[PDB]
Coordinates of C-alpha atoms and ligand atoms in Angstrom, one line a residue:
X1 CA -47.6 -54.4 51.1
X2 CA -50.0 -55.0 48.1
X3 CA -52.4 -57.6 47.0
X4 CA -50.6 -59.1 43.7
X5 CA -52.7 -59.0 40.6
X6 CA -51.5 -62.1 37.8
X7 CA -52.7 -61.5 34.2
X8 CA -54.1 -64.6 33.1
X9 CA -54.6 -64.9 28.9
X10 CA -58.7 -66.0 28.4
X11 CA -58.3 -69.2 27.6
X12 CA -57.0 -69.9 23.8
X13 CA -57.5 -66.6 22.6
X14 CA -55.1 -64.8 20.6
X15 CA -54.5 -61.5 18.6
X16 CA -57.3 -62.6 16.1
X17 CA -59.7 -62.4 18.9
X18 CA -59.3 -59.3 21.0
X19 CA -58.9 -57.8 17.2
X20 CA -62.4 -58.8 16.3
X21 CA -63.3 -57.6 19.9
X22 CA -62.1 -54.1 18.6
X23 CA -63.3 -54.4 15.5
X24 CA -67.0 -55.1 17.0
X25 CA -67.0 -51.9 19.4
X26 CA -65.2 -49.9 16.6
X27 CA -68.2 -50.7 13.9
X28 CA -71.1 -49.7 17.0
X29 CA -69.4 -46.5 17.5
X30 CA -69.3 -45.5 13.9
X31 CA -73.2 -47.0 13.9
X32 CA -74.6 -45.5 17.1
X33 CA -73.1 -41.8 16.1
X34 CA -76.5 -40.2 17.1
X35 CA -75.4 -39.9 21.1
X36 CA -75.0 -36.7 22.9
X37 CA -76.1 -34.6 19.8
X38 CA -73.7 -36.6 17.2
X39 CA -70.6 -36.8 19.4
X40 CA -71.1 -40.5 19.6
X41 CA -69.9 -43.0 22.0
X42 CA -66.0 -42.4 21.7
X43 CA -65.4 -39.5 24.2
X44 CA -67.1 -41.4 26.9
X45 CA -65.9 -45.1 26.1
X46 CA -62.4 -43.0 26.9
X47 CA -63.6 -41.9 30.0
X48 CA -64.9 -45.6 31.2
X49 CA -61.3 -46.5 30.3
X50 CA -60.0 -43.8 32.8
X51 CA -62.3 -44.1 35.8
X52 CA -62.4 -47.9 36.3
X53 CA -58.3 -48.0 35.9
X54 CA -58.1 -44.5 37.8
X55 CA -58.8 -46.0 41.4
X56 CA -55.6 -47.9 41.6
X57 CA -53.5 -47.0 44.4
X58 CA -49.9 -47.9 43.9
X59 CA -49.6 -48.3 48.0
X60 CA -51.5 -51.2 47.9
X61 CA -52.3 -52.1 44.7
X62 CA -56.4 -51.7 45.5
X63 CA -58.9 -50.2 42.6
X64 CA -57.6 -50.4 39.0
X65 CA -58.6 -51.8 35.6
X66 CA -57.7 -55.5 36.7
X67 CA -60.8 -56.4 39.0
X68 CA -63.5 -54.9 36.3
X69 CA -65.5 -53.9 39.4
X70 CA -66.8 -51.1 37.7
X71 CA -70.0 -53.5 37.1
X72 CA -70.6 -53.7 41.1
X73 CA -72.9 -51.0 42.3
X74 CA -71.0 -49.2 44.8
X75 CA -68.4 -48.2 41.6
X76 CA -71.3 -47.8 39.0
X77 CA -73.1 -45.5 41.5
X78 CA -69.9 -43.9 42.6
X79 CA -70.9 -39.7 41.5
X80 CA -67.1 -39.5 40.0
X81 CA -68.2 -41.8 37.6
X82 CA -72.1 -40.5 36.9
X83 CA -72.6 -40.7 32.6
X84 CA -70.5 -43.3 32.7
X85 CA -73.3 -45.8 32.6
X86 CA -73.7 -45.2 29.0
X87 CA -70.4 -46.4 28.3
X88 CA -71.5 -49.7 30.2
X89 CA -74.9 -49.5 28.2
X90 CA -72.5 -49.4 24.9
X91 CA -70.4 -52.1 25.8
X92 CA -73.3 -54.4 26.7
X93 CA -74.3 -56.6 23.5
X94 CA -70.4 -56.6 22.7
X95 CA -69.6 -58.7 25.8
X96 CA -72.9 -60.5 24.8
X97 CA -71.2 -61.3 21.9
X98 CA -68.0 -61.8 23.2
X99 CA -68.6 -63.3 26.7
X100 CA -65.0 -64.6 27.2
X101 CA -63.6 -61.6 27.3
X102 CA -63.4 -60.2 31.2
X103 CA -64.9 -56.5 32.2
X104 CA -61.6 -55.5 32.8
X105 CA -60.6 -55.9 29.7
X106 CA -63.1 -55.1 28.0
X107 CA -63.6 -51.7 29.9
X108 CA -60.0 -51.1 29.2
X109 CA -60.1 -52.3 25.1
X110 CA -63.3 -50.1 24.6
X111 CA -60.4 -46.9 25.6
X112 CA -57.7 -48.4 23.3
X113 CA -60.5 -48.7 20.4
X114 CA -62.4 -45.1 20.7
X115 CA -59.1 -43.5 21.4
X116 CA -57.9 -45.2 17.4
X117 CA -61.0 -45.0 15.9
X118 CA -61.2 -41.2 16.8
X119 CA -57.4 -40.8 14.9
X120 CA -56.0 -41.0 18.1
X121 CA -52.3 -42.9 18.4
X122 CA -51.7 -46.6 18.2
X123 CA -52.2 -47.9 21.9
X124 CA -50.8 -51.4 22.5
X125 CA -52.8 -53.2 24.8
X126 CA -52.3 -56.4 26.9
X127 CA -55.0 -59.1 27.4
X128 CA -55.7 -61.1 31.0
X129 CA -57.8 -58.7 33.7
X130 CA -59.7 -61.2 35.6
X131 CA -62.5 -60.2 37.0
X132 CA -62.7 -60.2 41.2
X133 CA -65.4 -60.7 43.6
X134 CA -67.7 -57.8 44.6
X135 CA -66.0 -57.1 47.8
X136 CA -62.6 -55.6 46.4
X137 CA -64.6 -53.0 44.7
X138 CA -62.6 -50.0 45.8
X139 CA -65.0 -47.3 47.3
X140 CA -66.1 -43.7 46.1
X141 CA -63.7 -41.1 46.3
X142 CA -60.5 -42.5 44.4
X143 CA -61.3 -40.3 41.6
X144 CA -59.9 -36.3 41.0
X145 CA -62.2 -33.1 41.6
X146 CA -61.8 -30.5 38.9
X147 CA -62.2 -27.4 40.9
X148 CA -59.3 -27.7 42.4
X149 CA -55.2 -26.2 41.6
X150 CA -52.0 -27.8 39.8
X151 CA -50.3 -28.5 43.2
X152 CA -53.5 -30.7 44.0
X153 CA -53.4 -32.0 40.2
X154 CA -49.8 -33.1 40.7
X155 CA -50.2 -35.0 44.5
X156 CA -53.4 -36.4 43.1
X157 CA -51.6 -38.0 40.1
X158 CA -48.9 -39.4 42.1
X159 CA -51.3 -41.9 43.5
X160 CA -51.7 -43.7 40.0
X161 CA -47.5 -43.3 39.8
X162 CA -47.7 -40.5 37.3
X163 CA -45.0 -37.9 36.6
X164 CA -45.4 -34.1 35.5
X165 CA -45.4 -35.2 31.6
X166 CA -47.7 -38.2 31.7
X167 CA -50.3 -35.8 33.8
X168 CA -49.4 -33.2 31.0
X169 CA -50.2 -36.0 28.4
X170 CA -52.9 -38.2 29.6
X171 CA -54.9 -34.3 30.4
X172 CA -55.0 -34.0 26.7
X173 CA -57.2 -36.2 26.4
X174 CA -59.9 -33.0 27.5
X175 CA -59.5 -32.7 23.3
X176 CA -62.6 -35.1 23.7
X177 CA -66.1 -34.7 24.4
X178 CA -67.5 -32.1 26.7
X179 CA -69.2 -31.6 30.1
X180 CA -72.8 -32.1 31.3
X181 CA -74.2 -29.8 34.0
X182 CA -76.4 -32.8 35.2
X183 CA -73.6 -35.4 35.9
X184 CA -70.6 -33.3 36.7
X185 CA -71.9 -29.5 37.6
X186 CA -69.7 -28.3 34.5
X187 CA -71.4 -27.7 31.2
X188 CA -69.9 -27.5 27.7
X189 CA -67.7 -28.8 25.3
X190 CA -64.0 -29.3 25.7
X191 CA -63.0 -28.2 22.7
X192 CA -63.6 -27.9 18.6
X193 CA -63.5 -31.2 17.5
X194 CA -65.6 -33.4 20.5
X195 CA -64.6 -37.1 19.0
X196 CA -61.5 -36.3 17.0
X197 CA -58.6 -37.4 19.1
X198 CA -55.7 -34.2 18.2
X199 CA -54.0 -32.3 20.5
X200 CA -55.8 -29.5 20.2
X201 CA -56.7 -29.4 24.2
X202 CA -52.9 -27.5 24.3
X203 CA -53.4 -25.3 21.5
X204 CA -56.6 -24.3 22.7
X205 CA -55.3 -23.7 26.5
X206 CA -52.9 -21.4 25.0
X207 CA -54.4 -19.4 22.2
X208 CA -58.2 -19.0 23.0
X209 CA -59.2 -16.0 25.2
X210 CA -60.3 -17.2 28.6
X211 CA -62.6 -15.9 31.5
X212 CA -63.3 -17.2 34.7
X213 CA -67.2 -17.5 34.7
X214 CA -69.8 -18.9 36.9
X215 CA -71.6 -22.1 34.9
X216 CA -75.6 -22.7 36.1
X217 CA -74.7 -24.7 38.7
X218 CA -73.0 -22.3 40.5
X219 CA -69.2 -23.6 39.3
X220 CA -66.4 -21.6 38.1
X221 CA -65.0 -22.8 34.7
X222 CA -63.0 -21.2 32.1
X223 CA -64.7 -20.1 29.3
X224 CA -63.5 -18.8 25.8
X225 CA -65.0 -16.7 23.0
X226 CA -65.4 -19.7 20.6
X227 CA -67.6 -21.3 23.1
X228 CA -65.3 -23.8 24.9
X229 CA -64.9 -25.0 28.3
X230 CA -62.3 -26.0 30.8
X231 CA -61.9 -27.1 34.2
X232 CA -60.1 -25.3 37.1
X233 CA -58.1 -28.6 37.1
X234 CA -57.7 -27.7 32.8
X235 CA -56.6 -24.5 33.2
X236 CA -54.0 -24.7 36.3
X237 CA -51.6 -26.8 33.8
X238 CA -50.9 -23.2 31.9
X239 CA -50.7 -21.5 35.8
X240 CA -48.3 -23.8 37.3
X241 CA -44.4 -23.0 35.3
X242 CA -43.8 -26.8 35.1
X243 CA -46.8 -27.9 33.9
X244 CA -47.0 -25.2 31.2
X245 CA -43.6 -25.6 29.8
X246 CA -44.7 -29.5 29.1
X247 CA -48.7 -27.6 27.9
X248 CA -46.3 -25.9 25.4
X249 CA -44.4 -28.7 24.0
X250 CA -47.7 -31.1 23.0
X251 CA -49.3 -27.9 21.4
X252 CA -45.8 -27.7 19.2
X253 CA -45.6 -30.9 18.4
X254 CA -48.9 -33.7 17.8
X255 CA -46.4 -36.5 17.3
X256 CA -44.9 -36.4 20.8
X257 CA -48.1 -35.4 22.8
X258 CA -49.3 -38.8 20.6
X259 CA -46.0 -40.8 21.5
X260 CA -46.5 -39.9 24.9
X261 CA -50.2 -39.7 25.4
X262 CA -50.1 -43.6 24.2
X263 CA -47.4 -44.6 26.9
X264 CA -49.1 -42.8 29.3
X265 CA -52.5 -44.4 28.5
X266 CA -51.5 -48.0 28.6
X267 CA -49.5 -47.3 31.7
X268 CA -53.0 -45.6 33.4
X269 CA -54.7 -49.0 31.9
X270 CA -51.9 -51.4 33.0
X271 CA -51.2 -50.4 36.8
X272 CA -51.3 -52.9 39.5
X273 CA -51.4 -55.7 36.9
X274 CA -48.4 -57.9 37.0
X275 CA -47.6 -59.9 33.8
X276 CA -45.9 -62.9 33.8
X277 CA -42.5 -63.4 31.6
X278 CA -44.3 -65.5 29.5
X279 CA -47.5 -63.0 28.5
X280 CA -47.9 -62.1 25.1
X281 CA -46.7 -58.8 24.0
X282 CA -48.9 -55.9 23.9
X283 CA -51.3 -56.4 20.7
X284 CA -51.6 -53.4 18.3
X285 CA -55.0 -53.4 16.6
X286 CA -55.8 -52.0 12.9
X287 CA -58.6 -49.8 12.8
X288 CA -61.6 -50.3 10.8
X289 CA -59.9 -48.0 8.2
X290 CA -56.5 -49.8 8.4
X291 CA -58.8 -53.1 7.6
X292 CA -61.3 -51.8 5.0
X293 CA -63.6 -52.4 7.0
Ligands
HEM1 C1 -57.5 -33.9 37.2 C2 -57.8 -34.8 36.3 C3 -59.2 -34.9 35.7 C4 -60.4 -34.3 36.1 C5 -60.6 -33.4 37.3 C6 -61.4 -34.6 35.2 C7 -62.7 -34.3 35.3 C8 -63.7 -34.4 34.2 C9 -65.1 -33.9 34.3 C10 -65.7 -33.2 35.6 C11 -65.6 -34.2 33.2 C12 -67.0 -34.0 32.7 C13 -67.9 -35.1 33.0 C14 -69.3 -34.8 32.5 O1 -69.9 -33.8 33.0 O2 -69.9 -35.4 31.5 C15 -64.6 -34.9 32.3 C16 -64.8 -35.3 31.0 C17 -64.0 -36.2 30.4 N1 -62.8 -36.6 30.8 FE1 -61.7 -36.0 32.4 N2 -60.8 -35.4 34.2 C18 -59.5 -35.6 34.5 C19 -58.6 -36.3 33.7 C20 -59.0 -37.1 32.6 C21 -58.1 -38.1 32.0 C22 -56.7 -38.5 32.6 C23 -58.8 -38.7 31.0 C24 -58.3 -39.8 30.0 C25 -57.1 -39.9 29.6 C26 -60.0 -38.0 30.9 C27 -61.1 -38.2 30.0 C28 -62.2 -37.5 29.9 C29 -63.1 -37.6 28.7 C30 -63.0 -38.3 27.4 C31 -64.3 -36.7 29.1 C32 -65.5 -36.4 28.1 C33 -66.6 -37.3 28.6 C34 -67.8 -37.2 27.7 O3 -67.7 -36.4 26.7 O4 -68.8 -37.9 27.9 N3 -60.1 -37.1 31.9 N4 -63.4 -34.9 33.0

């Protein structure tokens, strides 16, 4: 079984560091606001987050956020992760300015920061991904398809150790951002409010008016009146009883879908690392607002 993954602090550094880490990606997503037609930087910065830790495989502890491989061709290029270079192209003059800090973490902090910046929940996040050799980049493949149903949704998710509710949870995070017909062959945005982190993905599932159409690129998606989009992956969480029962709950009630997007989150961000009994705890940054900054 498993290759066993130690988080190791960057040497000396402390809450006041990975905090000024944060602070420097928070202050170039409220500056670079321009991209993808003033979405900015925060919906994709999310999805970074998400693909590099998404390839873990909790049989043997391959892929996930730990290695930071995501900087090794065969992961950058993977066609799961295509747009995703523009996080990387983000990121870039803050690990410049912060070159202590390893890819892993970084990849994983620039999540934690555009998920709070956007009024998303606290997420507490633990230092010490070490960065590994080019070989145990995991190959393409590891990551979902969205045309696809709940039951695939569900065995997909138990890969990465997740349950019907942090599925439920960590899927809300389709409040952010939007589709490109060039990198994924779905076009549109998710939702209302593209970089304001609410949980307005459940509402929207279950109030707007949907039809199945055909996008230009030949893919069904589900598209609503107001002009919104989801995936066939999106929409089977309010066709599967389970799932929409849980699809239900988070469009009642913002503070649990927060409570448990955030657990859910870290856990996504944390798999296959294994911290020792004397790691610090999980650090909660203030956002730039919290600071005054
Ligand atoms: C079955 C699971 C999922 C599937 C099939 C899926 C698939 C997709 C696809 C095809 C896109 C559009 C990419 C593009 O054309 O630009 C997208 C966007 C996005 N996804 Fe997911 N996703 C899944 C789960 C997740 C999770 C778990 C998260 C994070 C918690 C997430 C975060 C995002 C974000 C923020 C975007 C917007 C990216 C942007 O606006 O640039 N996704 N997703």
């Amino acid at each position: 079984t498993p290759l066993v993954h130690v988080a190791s602090v960057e040497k000396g550094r402390s809450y006041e560091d990975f905090q000024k880490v944060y602070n420097a990606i928070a202050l170039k997503l409220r500056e670079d606001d321009e991209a993808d037609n003033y979405i900015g930087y925060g919906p994709v910065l999310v999805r970074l987050a998400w693909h590099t830790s998404g390839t873990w495989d909790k049989h043997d502890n391959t892929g996930g956020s730990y290695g930071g491989t995501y900087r090794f061709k065969k992961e950058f290029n993977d066609p799961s992760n295509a747009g995703l270079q523009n996080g990387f192209k983000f990121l870039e003059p803050i690990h410049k300015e912060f070159p202590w800090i390893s890819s892993g973490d970084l990849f994983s902090l620039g999540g934690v920061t555009a998920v709070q910046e956007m009024q998303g929940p606290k997420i507490p996040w633990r230092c010490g991904r070490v960065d590994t050799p080019e070989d145990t980049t995991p190959d393409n493949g590891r990551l979902p398809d969205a045309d696809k149903d709940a039951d695939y949704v569900r065995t997909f998710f138990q890969r990465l150790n997740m349950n019907d509710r942090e599925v439920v949870a960590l899927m809300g995070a389709h409040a952010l951002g939007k589709t490109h017909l060039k990198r994924s062959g779905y076009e549109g945005p998710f939702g209302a409010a593209n970089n304001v982190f609410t949980n307005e993905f459940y509402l929207n599932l279950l109030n707007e008016d949907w039809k199945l159409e055909k996008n230009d690129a030949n893919n069904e998606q589900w598209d609503s009146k107001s002009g919104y989009m989801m995936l066939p992956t999106d929409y089977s969480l309010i066709q599967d009883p389970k799932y929409l029962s849980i699809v239900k709950e988070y469009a009642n009630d913002q503070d649990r879908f927060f409570k448990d997007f955030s657990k859910a989150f870290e856990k996504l961000l944390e798999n296959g690392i294994t911290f020792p009994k004397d790691a610090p705890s999980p650090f909660i940054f203030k956002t730039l607002e919290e600071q005054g900054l």
